[PDB]
Each structure stands twice: as C-alpha cells, then as structure tokens.
Amino acid sequence: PGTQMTLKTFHFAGVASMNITLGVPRIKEIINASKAISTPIITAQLDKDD
Amino acid sequence: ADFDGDEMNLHLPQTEEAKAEALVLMGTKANLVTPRNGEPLIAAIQDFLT
Amino acid sequence: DDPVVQEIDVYLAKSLAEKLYLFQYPVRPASMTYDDIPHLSAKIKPKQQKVELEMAIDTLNPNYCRSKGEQIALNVDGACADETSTYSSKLMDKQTFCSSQTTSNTSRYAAALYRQGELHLTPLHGILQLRPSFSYLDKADAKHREREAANEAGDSSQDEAEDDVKQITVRFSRPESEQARQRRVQSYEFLQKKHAEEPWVHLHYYGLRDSRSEHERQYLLCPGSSGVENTELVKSPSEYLMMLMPPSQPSNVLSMAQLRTLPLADQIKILMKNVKVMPFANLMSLLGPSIDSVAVLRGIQKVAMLVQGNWVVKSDILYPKDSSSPHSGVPAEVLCRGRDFVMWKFTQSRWVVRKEVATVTKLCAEDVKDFLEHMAVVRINKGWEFILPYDGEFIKKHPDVVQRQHMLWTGIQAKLEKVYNL
Amino acid sequence: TEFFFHTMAGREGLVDTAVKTAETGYMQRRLVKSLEDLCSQYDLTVRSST
Amino acid sequence: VGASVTSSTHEKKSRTNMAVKQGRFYLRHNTLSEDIPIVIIFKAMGVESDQEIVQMIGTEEHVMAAFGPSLEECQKAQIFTQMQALKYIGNKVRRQRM
Amino acid sequence: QGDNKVDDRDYYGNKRLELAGQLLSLLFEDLFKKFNSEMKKIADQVIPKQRAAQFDVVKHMRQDQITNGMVNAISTGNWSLKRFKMDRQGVTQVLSRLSYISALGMMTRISSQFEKTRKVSGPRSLQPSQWGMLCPSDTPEGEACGLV
RNA sequence: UGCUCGC
DNA sequence: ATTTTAGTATATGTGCTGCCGTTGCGAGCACGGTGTTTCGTCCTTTCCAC
DNA sequence: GTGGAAAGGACGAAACACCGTGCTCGCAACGGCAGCACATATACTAAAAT
Numbered sequence: 045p046g047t048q049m050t051l052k053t054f055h056f057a058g059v060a061s062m063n064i065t066l067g068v069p070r071i072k073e074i075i076n077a078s079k080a081i082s083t084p085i086i087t088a089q090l091d092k093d094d
Numbered sequence: 095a096d097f098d099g100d101e102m103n104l105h106l107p108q109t110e111e112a113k114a115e116a117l118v119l120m121g122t123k124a125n126l127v128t129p130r131n132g133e134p135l136i137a138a139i140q141d142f143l144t
Numbered sequence: 145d146d147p148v149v150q151e152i153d154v155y156l157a158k159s160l161a162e163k164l165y166l167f168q169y170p171v172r173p174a175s176m177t178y179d180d181i182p183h184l185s186a187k188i189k190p191k192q193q194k195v196e197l198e199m200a201i202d203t204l205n206p207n208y209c210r211s212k213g214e215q216i217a218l219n220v221d222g223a224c225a226d227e228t229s230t231y232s233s234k235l236m237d238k239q240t241f242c243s244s245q246t247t248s249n250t251s252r253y254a255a256a257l258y259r260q261g262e263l264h265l266t267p268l269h270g271i272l273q274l275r276p277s278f279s280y281l282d283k284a285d286a287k288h289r290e291r292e293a294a295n296e297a298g299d300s301s302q303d304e305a306e307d308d309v310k311q312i313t314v315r316f317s318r319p320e321s322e323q324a325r326q327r328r329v330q331s332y333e334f335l336q337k338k339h340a341e342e343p344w345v346h347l348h349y350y351g352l353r354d355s356r357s358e359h360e361r362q363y364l365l366c367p368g369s370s371g372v373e374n375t376e377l378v379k380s381p382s383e384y385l386m387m388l389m390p391p392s393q394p395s396n397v398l399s400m401a402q403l404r405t406l407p408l409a410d411q412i413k414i415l416m417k418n419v420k421v422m423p424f425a426n427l428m429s430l431l432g433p434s435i436d437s438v439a440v441l442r443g444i445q446k447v448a449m450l451v452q453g454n455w456v457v458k459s460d461i462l463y464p465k466d467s468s469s470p471h472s473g474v475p476a477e478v479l480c481r482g483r484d485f486v487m488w489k490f491t492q493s494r495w496v497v498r499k500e501v502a503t504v505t506k507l508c509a510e511d512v513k514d515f516l517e518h519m520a521v522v523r524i525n526k527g528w529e530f531i532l533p534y535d536g537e538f539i540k541k542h543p544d545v546v547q548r549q550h551m552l553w554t555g556i557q558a559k560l561e562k563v564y565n566l
Numbered sequence: 567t568e569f570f571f572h573t574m575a576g577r578e579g580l581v582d583t584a585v586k587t588a589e590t591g592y593m594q595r596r597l598v599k600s601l602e603d604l605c606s607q608y609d610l611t612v613r614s615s616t
Numbered sequence: 617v618g619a620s621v622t623s624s625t626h627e628k629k630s631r632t633n634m635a636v637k638q639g640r641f642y643l644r645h646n647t648l649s650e651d652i653p654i655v656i657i658f659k660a661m662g663v664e665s666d667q668e669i670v671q672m673i674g675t676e677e678h679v680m681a682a683f684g685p686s687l688e689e690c691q692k693a694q695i696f697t698q699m700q701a702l703k704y705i706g707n708k709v710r711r712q713r714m
Numbered sequence: 715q716g717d718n719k720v721d722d723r724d725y726y727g728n729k730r731l732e733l734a735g736q737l738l739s740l741l742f743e744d745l746f747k748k749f750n751s752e753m754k755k756i757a758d759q760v761i762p763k764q765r766a767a768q769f770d771v772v773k774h775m776r777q778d779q780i781t782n783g784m785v786n787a788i789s790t791g792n793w794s795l796k797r798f799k800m801d802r803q804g805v806t807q808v809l810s811r812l813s814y815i816s817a818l819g820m821m822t823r824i825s826s827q828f829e830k831t832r833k834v835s836g837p838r839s840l841q842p843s844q845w846g847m848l849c850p851s852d853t854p855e856g857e858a859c860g861l862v
Numbered sequence: 863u864g865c866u867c868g869c
Numbered sequence: 870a871t872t873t874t875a876g877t878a879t880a881t882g883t884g885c886t887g888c889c890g891t892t893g894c895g896a897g898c899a900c901g902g903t904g905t906t907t908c909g910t911c912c913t914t915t916c917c918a919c
Numbered sequence: 920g921t922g923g924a925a926a927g928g929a930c931g932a933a934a935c936a937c938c939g940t941g942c943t944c945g946c947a948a949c950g951g952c953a954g955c956a957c958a959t960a961t962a963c964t965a966a967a968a969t
C-alpha cells in the first residue's frame with residue numbers, strides 16, 4: 045500500500061487547516077517510533093460538549 | 095504488467111522438491127487472493143469486463 | 145503645455161571654480177547646525193583632498209559629564225606630560241571631524257545660487273563627507289601599551305643597566321619579486337604613507353555669522369547682461385547625442401541600414417540578388433527619394449533585365465563563375481543559360497510550361513523548379529505565370545531603355561537558338 | 567496557458583511517483599528485514615527466532 | 617531566514633552568508649574561524665558611527681527594533697573604532713596552514 | 715524576516731546557461747597556464763647549470779600537452795580545473811544516432827547543476843518561468859525527469 | 863567506472 | 870554549640886560536530902587502465918674530409 | 920661513392936611518492952539517532968561568626 049499510496053493533499057480531516065503528515069511519511073514516522081514527530085495531534089473530549 | 099515492453103524473468107527449478115513446493119505453495123489457482131485483505135487479484139480485466 | 149511662466153535665466157561664474165567645496169555631515173541633521181560651535185582649526189591638503197576640522201566644545205553645559213571628561217583625558221594623554229596632548233586642559237575639549245572623498249571627479253556637480261529671476265551655477269572643486277573621527281582612542285591604546293611596557297620594566301624597584309646593545313641587525317635589501325612588489329604597492333600601509341608624505345596646511349574658520357561670509361558670498365555671481373547669446377552650446381541634438389553616446393569603434397546577411405551605408409551600385413546589386421523580381425517604383429521607394437532616377441536606372445541596367453515591364457536580376461549575379469547547382473552540381477554556366485532561356489520564354493509569353501523548359505534545357509526537375517519559383521507562381525490549368533503584372537507605365541516613361549532591353553533580348557535569343565538549337 | 571498548467575500537473579505527478587518509488591522501496595526493505603523472523607508455530611503461538 | 621551571496625570574479629569565488637540565529641546578524645565566511653557580528657564588520661569597513669549604520673540599514677521602526685539586539689551586542693564589547701574591529705577580526709583569522 | 719517573501723531557487727530569471735564556448739575557454743586557459751608553468755619550471759631547471767649552450771624553449775615546447783588535455787576532456791567528459799577547483803562530470807555525451815529526431819533533440823539538451831543522485835523534487839517541477847524558453851513536455855521519463 | 867535507455 | 874554562607878561535586882540537561890542511510894531489475898555503449906621525471910645506455914644517422 | 924668519430928634521440932631504469940611551487944578551494948545533498956563537551960544549577964556538607 046505504500047506504493048499504492050499516492051501521497052495526496054488537501055486531506056485536512058474536515059477542519060480545512062492544521063496540515064498533518066499522512067501517507068508514507070506518516071507510516072515512516074510511526075514505524076520509526078521517534079520520540080518527537082512532526083505535527084502532533086491530541087484529541088480531547090469535553091465534559092460539557094454542547 | 096501492461097504489455098508495453100515489460101521484460102519478465104522465468105526460472106526453472108533443478109529439484110523435484112523445489113518443483114513440488116513451487117507448484118503447491120505458489121500455484122496460480124492457490125493464490126487467487128492477496129493476503130493483504132483477501133480480495134481476489136486474478137480476475138477479469140479490460141476487454142473482458144466490457 | 146507651453147512655458148507660461150517662470151522663464152528664469154541661467155548664469156555661470158568662474159570666480160570660485162577652484163575654491164568651492166561641499167561639506168555634508170551624514171550624522172548631523174539639517175535642523176542643528178555648527179554656527180554656534182566655535183571652531184579652532186582646519187587641516188587640509190591641496191592634492192588628495194582630506195580636510196580635518198578641529199573644533200571646541202563647551203564644558204559648563206549640563207549635557208557634559210565632567211567626571212567622564214577627566215577620565216577620557218587621563219586615558220588619552222599622560223598625567224602631566226602635555227608635550228603632545230590631544231586636549232589642552234584636563235577635560236575633553238577638542239573634537240575632530242575627518243573627511244572622506246566621495247568621488248574623484250566633481251565636474252558634473254555644481255552649486256546653484258537662486259536670485260529673483262536668475263540662477264547662478266558654480267563648479268565644485270571637490271566634495272567630502274565629514275564624520276566624527278575616533279582618533280583619540282588610538283593614541284589612548286598606544287599610551288596604554290607604553291604604560292604596560294613601563295609596568296613590565298618596573299617589575300623590580302631598581303633595574304640593572306641592561307646589556308641590551310643593539311647587535312647590527314641590518315637586513316638584506318632583498319631584490320623583491322615583481323608580484324611581491326606589486327602587493328607592497330597595493331598595500332594599505334603604503335597608500336597611507338604616500339598620503340601622509342604630503343604636508344598639511346592649516347586654515348582658520350569663518351562662520352556664517354561672520355561678515356566675511358556675506359562678503360565672499362557675492363563671488364558666486366557674475367557681471368553680465370541679462371540677454372547674451374552664448375558662443376558655445378550651439379550643437380544640434382544629433383551632435384549632442386553622438387557626443388554623449390560615442391561609438392565603440394544566406395545572402396541577406398546585410399541589413400537595411402548596412403545596405404544604405406553602401407554605394408548605390410552595391411545597394412542595387414544586393415537588392416536584385418535578394419528579391420530578384422521588383423518594379424522600378426518599388427526600387428526607387430526602397431533606395432530613397434533623395435537619389436536621382438537616372439543613376440538608379442543606370443545601376444539597375446547593369447545587374448537586371450526588363451521582362452514585361454518589370455526588372456529581373458541577371459543570371460550571372462545569382463550564380464558566380466565559381467558556384468554550382470546545390471541540387472545537381474552542374475556548372476553555373478548551364479544554370480545561367482537555363483535561366484536566360486526561362487526569362488526569354490517569359491518575355492515571349494506570360495505563361496511558361498515547366499515540361500517544355502525541362503525538355504529543351506535538358507535540366508533536372510529541381511533546377512527548373514528553382515528557376516521558376518524565383519520569378520513565377522503556379523496557376524492551375526494555366527501553368528506558370530509571372531509573379532508581377534504587366535507594368536506599362538515604366539515602358540511608356542522610358543522607351544529608349546525598352547529598345548535597349550529589346551535588342552539585348554534579341555541577342556540573348558540568338559545565343560539561345562545557337563546553343564539549344566531552337 | 568491551460569496546456570502549460572496541465573503539463574505542470576503532469577510533471578508534479580511524475581516527480582511524486584518518482585520519489586514514492588524509492589521511498590516505499592526503502593520502507594519495504596526495512597519492514598521485511600525487521601519482520602522476516604516471525605513464524606506461526608503449531609501451538610497457535612507466534613514466536614520469534616530466539 | 618538568512619542570506620547568502622556567492623561573489624564570483626574571474627579569479628576567486630566566495631560564498632559569504634548572514635544569519636539571525638540569535639536575533640542578531642552574524643556574517644559567516646570560509647576564511648573566518650567564527651562568525652562575527654555585522655556591526656563589528658561595519659566598524660571595520662570605515663563607518664564607525666552607529667547612527668550612520670542604522671541609517672544605512674533603514675529608518676523603519678520595525679527595522680530599528682530588529683537591529684537593536686545587534687547594536688546592544690556590539691556595545692557589550694569595547695569595539696568602537698576601526699582599529700579595534702580590525703584587530704577583533706584578525707583574531708578570528710586562521711593562517712592557511714603556515 | 716516578517717512577511718515570508720523568500721526567494722525561490724527554481725526561478726529561471728536567476729539561472730545562467732554555459733555553452734561549449736565558456737567551458738572550452740576555461741579549459742584552454744587552464745591548459746595554457748599549466749603549459750606556461752611547465753615551461754618556466756624547465757627554464758629554471760635548465761638555464762642556470764647546463765652549459766654555455768644557451769637554453770631555448772623551442773627544444774622543450776611539448777606539443778602533446780594541450781592536445782592530450784583537450785582530447786581527454788572531450789572524450790571522457792570529466793573536467794577537473796584546479797585553478798578554479800571545478801570537478802564536473804558528464805559534460806560530454808555520445809551523440810545518439812538512433813534517428814535524425816534523436817540527434818536533433820539531443821543537440822538542444824540542457825542538464826541541471828543538481829546532477830541527479832537524490833530525490834530533490836524541488837527543481838524537477840515545471841516552473842512557469844520556462845515559458846517560451848524551454849519545452850514543458852519534452853523530458854526523459856525516469857530518474858532524470860525534470861532535471862534534463 | 864562513468865552515461866543514454868527499457869517499466 | 871548552632872544557623873548561615875562558601876564550595877564542590879556530580880548529574881543533568883540543552884547543544885553541536887559525527888556517521889549512517891537514501892526501489893528493483895534489465896539492456897546497450899565510450900574510455901582508460903599508475904607513470905613519470907630525470908639519468909643513463911645504446912644505436913643510428915649524418916657535419917665535414919677523402 | 921666512403922668512413923671514423925660525434926651527437927643526439929629513444930627506450931630501460933631507479934629514487935621517490937602522483938601537483939612545476941609547497942596552497943588551498945567550495946559545498947555541505949537531507950534528515951536523524953547516538954554522542955561528548957561544557958556548563959552550570961542546585962543542594963549537600965562543613966567551616967566560621969555569634
């Protein structure tokens with residue numbers, strides 16, 4: 045799938061911002077298990093989400 | 095492959111055990127599906143679907 | 145947009161041509177001036193202009209730190225030496241401004257004094273930029289070095305008489321290589337020493353508030369009448385443009401301007417070689433109306449022939465004696481004979497058959513095609529037609545030339561009937 | 567202008583694929599060199615070479 | 617965001633760079649042991665007044681605000697004349713192997 | 715340092731094209747300087763100690779130096795100029811005689827300074843500056859895509 | 863060793 | 870004798886100059902191979918005299 | 920047409936080290952995980968004043 049992956053763009057995951065590394069660079073950063081990665085994302089849930 | 099000048103290799107085993115292992119494990123009829131997700135790769139193609 | 149108002153006259157003055165200098169302070173705004181600052185002296189050199197102003201600054205003003213003044217004065221000079229002191233008192237009292245030369249030549253710069261209805265211009269002998277020089281710190285560092293040497297010598301209270309007799313260390317005046325000699329000449333120390341070789345000249349300062357300023361200010365003007373026709377400054381715009389912009393020093397290689405720079409005969413020859421088909425009026429328009437028609441006619445009669453009122457370049461002009469056919473390699477004489485036969489067929493009839501010419505001249509298809517394309521176009525169901533229409537005006541205007549070309553074509557026809565057995 | 571923009575897009579795709587080939591080749595080499603030791607034993611437990 | 621200039625004549629080609637690694641501009645060249653502040657080089661090249669240097673850099677408020685740290689670092693040292701700056705530069709000069 | 719108006723290297727307005735003329739000029743200058751240095755060395759070695767028979771350069775002007783230098787630099791294609799410290803390779807290439815179009819297109823080729831060994835993907839893009847100057851579509855498909 | 867190619 | 874300051878002592882924590890990688894397989898071709906700088910032995914060829 | 924002696928040109932050959940002289944450049948191709956130097960911060964401990 046790495047060869048099958050096209051390394052596309054514009055995939056902001058619905059927020060139209062916050063450029064995140066996805067694709068072969070993302071898989072490489074995951075498999076390398078580096079302590080510091082590029083563009084770290086943390087999803088936090090709220091007690092009062094409304 | 096796309097039949098636009100691709101060169102492919104063809105090897106001949108020199109052992110009965112190797113020949114049997116190739117025919118059994120790497121048989122075309124026994125590898126109709128990829129181990130990635132089980133989807134069949136050997137199927138109809140252009141001029142066969144149409 | 146006419147010059148409605150302000151027709152100001154411009155006068156020139158040579159009284160202060162060699163005595164006018166421009167001093168600009170890049171670090172001092174125009175608001176604050178040095179009119180109230182009492183100056184003390186000005187060092188200057190006639191050659192290699194570099195003026196150093198030495199002025200005095202007040203001390204009792206609240207904008208001066210007397211403690212730091214005493215400190216810097218003790219640093220730059222000695223305790224009570226006063227033999228060569230940058231300051232007379234124990235405080236920083238004198239300030240040095242050093243000049244840097246902007247450009248070597250200042251002939252294109254001029255000072256303009258404006259009076260009611262007139263503007264007087266005066267050339268500038270030199271322009272220098274005055275900046276506050278930091279030279280007392282260098283002497284302070286030198287004095288600190290000599291004080292360090294004194295402290296080194298004073299390590300012991302009583303110093304024995306040193307037997308440091310100067311052994312004769314006279315070095316060889318080695319013959320210096322030309323590269324090393326050029327390096328020494330181009331060195332900064334050599335240039336600075338050469339500049340220092342010129343003796344200094346001391347000058348007093350006269351401020352703007354002094355009466356001498358207003359006295360000598362009148363020298364920028366010149367005695368002369370209001371309206372005087374200048375003897376010089378009378379060159380035409382073309383001459384001025386030539387002055388301020390001095391010069392550095394296929395067969396269609398030569399351009400139109402390079403053509404017009406050539407004699408008329410060469411112009412006609414090159415034009416007939418390039419176009420090979422053109423009327424007389426077009427040639428007169430291209431060469432120019434300033435050229436007489438008789439000269440152009442005599443020139444074209446030597447390199448062209450008359451076909452149906454038009455002019456076609458001669459065969460030998462296109463094909464020199466040493467040339468050959470680029471397609472078949474046949475000698476140029478056969479090409480000239482074939483082209484003469486084609487032109488004769490065109491003079492006899494406006495329509496020419498390619499197959500007949502190929503059969504008579506015994507030439508290949510490509511040579512006949514090249515001969516026809518130079519003077520004909522393909523008309524369907526009619527063969528080859530002459531590219532230009534019948535020009536009867538030139539024929540009516542010059543009957544003698546028509547008769548000359550007719551007898552020349554008669555001779556050419558006789559030669560062609562003798563050769564090709566027509 | 568449209569042809570020039572289309573050629574720009576095509577060259578961008580070409581260079582993207584050119585980089586992707588080598589990047590995924592190196593990634594595949596690393597992944598296979600790391601994962602080639604594992605094997606499924608007869609006791610239904612996946613064990614390494616050691 | 618730094619700058620680089622590859623000055624190439626018929627004889628020598630030298631690429632000199634300028635960096636802002638610590639809010640101040642340092643000039644880096646292959647002939648210098650350590651990059652030196654740009655204000656020291658300004659003082660070494662004839663112009664010694666800091667006001668003239670600031671005027672040459674620019675008169676915009678943000679320009680002065682950005683160039684302030686360089687002036688402060690220059691004033692931290694005792695480099696105020698051309699001779700001192702030239703000596704400081706020469707201290708950062710290494711001989712081309714004897 | 716404020717608005718990110720960073721200049722781009724791929725802008726061809728800042729690019730320069732060296733033909734065979736400038737390269738041959740630099741090579742001939744280097745070879746002539748080497749020949750002059752060799753002649754000066756031969757003079758320094760021969761004149762002061764040989765004999766009353768006066769030394770002349772004509773007996774030592776080797777004619778194979780410049781010829782061999784030019785031949786090797788043109789054939790092998792590697793240019794090593796110590797006076798300029800330029801070490802280039804692949805300057806000359808064998809003319810392809812596959813067809814007339816092949817040679818005609820190879821005659822107007824242009825190589826990049828990047829000298830492809832890695833995936834730069836920064837000059838390989840088709841910049842709008844190539845309008846009217848370079849062909850946008852003509853490029854070798856493969857590892858040399860965008861740099862030739 | 864270099865380089866042009868073939869996917 | 871006890872609380873405050875000086876030192877030292879190691880550990881830790883942020884750099885900055887090192888070493889290591891950079892798809893695959895295929896097919897052609899051109900060039901150059903370590904040499905060269907000066908010393909000497911050998912062989913040959915041709916300045917005048919016969 | 921000939922010859923005894925002379926020079927010089929070419930091909931082995933040995934001392935030294937790929938560059939005539941001793942100089943001399945640019946550029947990093949881009950990350951990225953080890954690090955080792957420094958540096959230096961802080962606290963622990965013990966000597967000194969009250």
Ligand SMILES: Nc1nc2c(ncn2[C@@H]2O[C@H](COP(=O)(O)OP(=O)(O)OP(=O)(O)O)[C@@H](O)[C@H]2O)c(=O)[nH]1
Pocket residue numbers: 863900901
């Ligand atoms: N310049 C150059 N170097 C070459 C050439 N062939 C080989 N090399 C060098 O030799 C190395 C590879 O050697 P091979 O090609 O295996 O030599 P080979 O083909 O075994 O040699 P043979 O046994 O004579 O066929 C490379 O690192 C090159 O630097 C050539 O034709 N030119």
Ligand SMILES: Nc1ncnc2c1ncn2[C@@H]1O[C@H](COP(=O)(O)OP(=O)(O)OP(=O)(O)O)C[C@H]1O
Pocket residue numbers: 587869892893
């Ligand atoms: N560098 C390479 N590495 C691996 N495989 C390659 C390489 N170059 C070519 N190939 C082979 O050629 C194939 C590439 O073809 P592909 O890119 O899918 O079509 P294409 O060349 O874009 O054709 P179109 O331009 O779409 O008509 C796939 C691969 O097996």
Ligand SMILES: [Mg+2]
Pocket residue numbers: 095096097098099100869
């Ligand atoms: Mg294919």
